[PDB]
Amino acid sequence: PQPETLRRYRAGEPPLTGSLLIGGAGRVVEPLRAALEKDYDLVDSFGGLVFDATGITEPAGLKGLHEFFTPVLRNLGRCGRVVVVGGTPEAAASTNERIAQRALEGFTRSLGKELRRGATTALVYLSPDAKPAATGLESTMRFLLSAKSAYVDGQVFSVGADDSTPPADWEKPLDGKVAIVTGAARGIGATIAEVFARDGAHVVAIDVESAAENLAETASKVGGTALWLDVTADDAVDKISEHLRDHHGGKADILVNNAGITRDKLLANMDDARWDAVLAVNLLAPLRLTEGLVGNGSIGEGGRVIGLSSIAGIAGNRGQTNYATTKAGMIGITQALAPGLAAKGITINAVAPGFIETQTREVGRRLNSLLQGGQPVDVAEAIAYFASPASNAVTGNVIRVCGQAMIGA
Amino acid sequence: PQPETLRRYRAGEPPLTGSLLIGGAGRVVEPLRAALEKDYDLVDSFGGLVFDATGITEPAGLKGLHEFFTPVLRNLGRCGRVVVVGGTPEAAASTNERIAQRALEGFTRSLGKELRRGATTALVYLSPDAKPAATGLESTMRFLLSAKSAYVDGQVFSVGADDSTPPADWEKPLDGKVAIVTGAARGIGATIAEVFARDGAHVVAIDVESAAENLAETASKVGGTALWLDVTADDAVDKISEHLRDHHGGKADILVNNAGITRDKLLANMDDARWDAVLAVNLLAPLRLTEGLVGNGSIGEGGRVIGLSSIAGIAGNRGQTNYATTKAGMIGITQALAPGLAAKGITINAVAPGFIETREVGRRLNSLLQGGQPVDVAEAIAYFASPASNAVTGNVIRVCGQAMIGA
């Protein structure tokens, strides 16, 4: 009983390898069909199973989940996508509807732990205030119903009421956009830059001076520019804005707060410098860069801020009272600023990676529904989803990229 | 690292095994000191370490956690208690403060994973509209700072703004209260009935007809009354109301929705009966009983509803799409009904047990290195049931020894 080689994004291929079945009842089934009609193969294997649960307003109606899924799970293909779409529970028209809509999460997390051959589950809630066409839902569904979401599993997405505008080209969604990526010389940051450039964006790649030639290498590979910077410095916002003005028209559309450090130590053995330095790089700097780049006009309307939280921030981790406080605080930034940024036309989100390959580890690779570690592209893809200019109805969200890792809160 | 023999509640014993250090800065350290002064040993080990974080309004201020805890952890006693008290992040007076208070949860859960010898952590949030005396905070701090909270670890408790009255005797907190406990013939339900009776309550023990014999025994052993019936039936609310009318002036103070069943099957193989039975017992019935008993005034002002969720309903489990959906549903009832019930002076909360002895892998995969005991789940429920926990509602607390599994 072993790990599937996971399907990942490749130019030119259809989003799903099988057909797309949209079932259930409520307000989303018909407009989603109309929207996905021309790029997806509507009803082969099922590449995708979508259930509209928005019509379920009492716990007695949860039966529809069973009635829809049980006959069709046999036909779900390799790396197939299961998504349940509900109404935001707090916004339901009754306490019965709230209970039912909330119950949907026990279902989708459980079904993630049953699906085979790299297939995944997700739960998406849509505001009851979205218009009937649900154009604000489309970027979320397109990311989920595709190879891009390869390592995102068992999670919950929250879409608001606003309408969206599709990008000129769904395969080039970040075309014309300027994106700043911190910690961009290596690892996940370098890959965010890559996936960003692939989607059409011009990247400002930031890292510390010691990451020298590595930062130039990334910058060259992605067709962007290298900016050598300590993000904790008093003058970081000024220097970032100066580079924007000198090389990118004074604006950025996107900021990815990817740079991060660990200094693991048990609390009983913790020193001031290890606490402070991790707090400075991981929490204080992304807060200062977000408030300062928005505040000086560098990032404005249509803007996107994505932070890197992590599983240790949600579940805790031994020797990481410093790091986990900062990753929990990243979630705080994301939740606290979302209402203010909305008022300025900016979204803010966070991606929380689990076990991702590449510079005990055995357990860490195995302990998830997908039976394997993730790849840096898997995290980059979740982050580009949020960066989309059609993702304006997504804000306040924290999405683990973890293979449905067992560990949590 | 070996598992510790966990200290559990026994009468006449001190709540903590060493002294109680209360530190930090904000609106809570002083009034909390004043409240716990006569019943605790304020400052031989530390039996408890409480840090007031409410003063922290910026991320730069989180260093106070370390400055408080780091020097004193050396002396934290066996089965010791660490609690950080913060201010509800949603209610913060600035986005900086929300961010800093939100961040406290990475801190308490990571520290849960470091603490040795049985000792546990908790985060408590207190509404910024609570009065300076913080009397609504007292039931939660007293549960946490005692042996009763033995298997609760790494969790997050949410206290509102309302004042509270202490019971006449903190050791008999449910004296003169009437409690309905479903699924009470055996197991966790029978133990809830016992702990309730220990705490001075009159228990109305409910279970099914086939359990009539076992239910009678339990009722006699706790000094309560048995009432067998099928909680799914059209007449359940009537039979219970009728029973209350007879024995307890038509009124119950507490309802515990403990009855629940599993019919495990992968969804690909799920049949109608296995889905429907599990939904009916575990979700439909508790809801209908709550709404019914509230609806006819059997549960009124001072009321307490407590539901059994479980870790399955939070994290999911293979072969439990039915049972998980019901247990997430119980969290749904908790959260959805809290606002309207609060207007009637009733709280509603849920406990979500982890691995409880009643196999090798789930026993050990928690910070406490051991499975729980049915008493540990009972205590959590009795904590919410308290007449002094009226400022505690809409909470979901796991009783899992800080099991690694989660969402």
Are residue B147 and residue B175 in the same domain, yes or no?
A: no
CA distance linking residue B89 with residue B97, whole number of Å: 7
CB atoms inside a 10 Å sphere around CB A256: 30
Strand partners, A124: A85, A157
Choose from A107, A121, A291 for mutation: most chain B CBs within 10 A. Answer: A107
Which single residue is written with the structure tokens 């979630």? Answer: A331
Are residue B154 and residue B196 in the same domain, yes or no?
A: no
Would an 8 Å CB–CB cutoff place B404 in contact with chain A? yes
Would an 8 Å CB–CB cutoff place A72 in contact with chain B? no
Residue A68's Cβ-count burial label (10 Å; 0-12, 13-18, 19+) is: buried
Length of chain B: 407
Phi, psi of A307 (to 5 degrees): -110, 160
**Residues near B194 by Cβ (< 8 Å), separated by ≥ 6?**
B221, B222, B378
Query: Which technique was used to obtain these atomic coordinates?
Result: X-ray
Q: Do B89 and A326 touch (CB under 8 A)?
A: no
Residue A401 annotated as lining a ligand binding site: no
- Per-residue CA distances from B380 to A57, A91, A384, B329, B402 (Å): 31, 30, 43, 20, 14
Q: Cβ distance A69 to B325 under 8 Å?
A: no
Of B60, B110, B279, the CB nearest to A318: B110
Q: Cβ distance A84 to A123 under 8 Å?
A: yes
Of B106, B279, B283, the CB nearest to A313: B106
**Residues near A230 by Cβ (< 8 Å), separated by ≥ 6?**
A208, A209, A236
Buried b (16+ CB within 10 A) or exposed e, B198-228: bbbbbbbbbbbeebeebbbebbeebebbbbb
Would an 8 Å CB–CB cutoff place B106 in contact with chain A? yes
Q: Cβ distance A334 to A396 under 8 Å?
A: yes
**Residues near A255 by Cβ (< 8 Å), separated by ≥ 6?**
A179, A180, A289, A290, A293, A299, A303, A304, A305, A306
Q: Do B106 and A272 touch (CB under 8 A)?
A: no
CA distance linking residue A365 with residue A350, whole number of Å: 22
Q: Do B59 and A279 touch (CB under 8 A)?
A: yes
Of A59, A74, A89, the CB nearest to B284: A59
Are residue B165 and residue B247 in the same domain, yes or no?
A: no
Of A140, A170, A200, which residue sits at a domain end?
A: A170
Phi, psi of A135 (to 5 degrees): -50, -25
Q: Do A315 and B99 touch (CB under 8 A)?
A: no
Are residue B87 and residue B194 in the same domain, yes or no?
A: no
Structural domain that includes position A12? 1-170
Are residue A299 and residue A373 in the same domain, yes or no?
A: yes
Joined together, the tokens standing for residue B109 give 């859960």
Q: Cβ distance A354 to A376 under 8 Å?
A: no
- Per-residue CA distances from A229 to A179, A196, A275, A309, B326 (Å): 16, 20, 21, 21, 51
Would an 8 Å CB–CB cutoff place B103 in contact with chain A? yes
CA distance linking residue A224 with residue A226, whole number of Å: 7
Are residue A81 and residue A213 in the same domain, yes or no?
A: no
Which single residue is written with the structure tokens 């002895």? Answer: B357
Would an 8 Å CB–CB cutoff place B273 in contact with chain A? no
> Which is catalytic among the residues A9, A40, A151, A323?
A323
CA distance linking residue A379 with residue A399, whole number of Å: 10
Choose from B69, B88, B99 for mutation: most chain A CBs within 10 A. Answer: B99
Q: Do B329 and A62 touch (CB under 8 A)?
A: yes
Under 8 Å CB pairs connecting chains A and B tally to 243
Are residue B182 and residue B239 in the same domain, yes or no?
A: yes
- Active-site residues of B, by number, are 323
What is the DSSP track for A319-367? T-HHHHHHHHHHHHHHHHHHHHHHTTT-EEEEEEE-SB----HHHHHHS
CA distance linking residue B11 with residue B146, whole number of Å: 11
Joined together, the tokens standing for residue B220 give 């006699």
Residue B229: give its domain's CATH number.
3.40.50.720
Strand partners, B76: B46
Which single residue is written with the structure tokens 């829809």? Answer: A68
Contacts of B344 in chain A (CB under 8 A): none
Joined together, the tokens standing for residue B136 give 């609504």
Q: Do A287 and B59 touch (CB under 8 A)?
A: yes
Indicate the resolution in Å.
Answer: 1.9
Choose from A56, A95, A368 for mutation: most chain B CBs within 10 A. Answer: A95
CA distance linking residue A255 with residue B140, whole number of Å: 41
Q: Cβ distance B351 to B399 under 8 Å?
A: yes
**Range 121-160 of B in CB contact (< 8 A) with A:** 154
Are residue A121 and residue A252 in the same domain, yes or no?
A: no
Are residue A291 and residue A357 in the same domain, yes or no?
A: yes
CA distance linking residue A209 with residue B166, whole number of Å: 60
Of B122, B143, B170, which residue sits at a domain end?
A: B170
Q: Cβ distance A130 to A136 under 8 Å?
A: yes
Pairing, β B155-159 against β A76-87 = unpaired
Residue A231 annotated as lining a ligand binding site: yes
Q: How far is A222 from chain B (nearest CA, A)?
A: 34
CB atoms inside a 10 Å sphere around CB A271: 12
**Residues near B331 by Cβ (< 8 Å), separated by ≥ 6?**
A102, B309, B313, B314, B350, B352, B396
Chain breaks in chain B (C to N over 2.5 A) after: 43, 358
Helices then strands, each counted (H, E), chain B: 13, 12
CB atoms inside a 10 Å sphere around CB A361: 9
**Residues near A77 by Cβ (< 8 Å), separated by ≥ 6?**
A17, A18, A45, A46, A47, A117, A119
Are residue B114 and residue B199 in the same domain, yes or no?
A: no
In this structure, the dihedral spanned by the alpha carbons of residues A20, A24, A26 and A31, taken in order and rounded to 10 degrees, is: 10
Joined together, the tokens standing for residue B399 give 């009783």
Structural domains of chain B, count: 2
CA distance linking residue A218 with residue B39, whole number of Å: 63
3-state secondary structure of A26: coil
Q: Do B324 and A110 touch (CB under 8 A)?
A: yes
Phi-psi region of B8 (alpha: psi -120 to 50; beta: other; left: phi over 0): beta
3-state secondary structure of A54: coil
3-state secondary structure of A146: coil
Of B120, B152, B170, which residue sits at a domain end?
A: B170
Q: How far is B125 from chain A (nearest CA, A)?
A: 15
Would an 8 Å CB–CB cutoff place B325 in contact with chain A? yes
Residue B224 annotated as lining a ligand binding site: no
In this structure, the dihedral spanned by the alpha carbons of residues A268, A270, A276 and A281, taken in order and rounded to 10 degrees, is: -100
Are residue A56 and residue A154 in the same domain, yes or no?
A: yes
Are residue B122 and residue B141 in the same domain, yes or no?
A: yes
- Per-residue CA distances from A23 to A26, B26, B62, B115, B402 (Å): 10, 53, 48, 49, 38
Would an 8 Å CB–CB cutoff place A276 in contact with chain B? yes
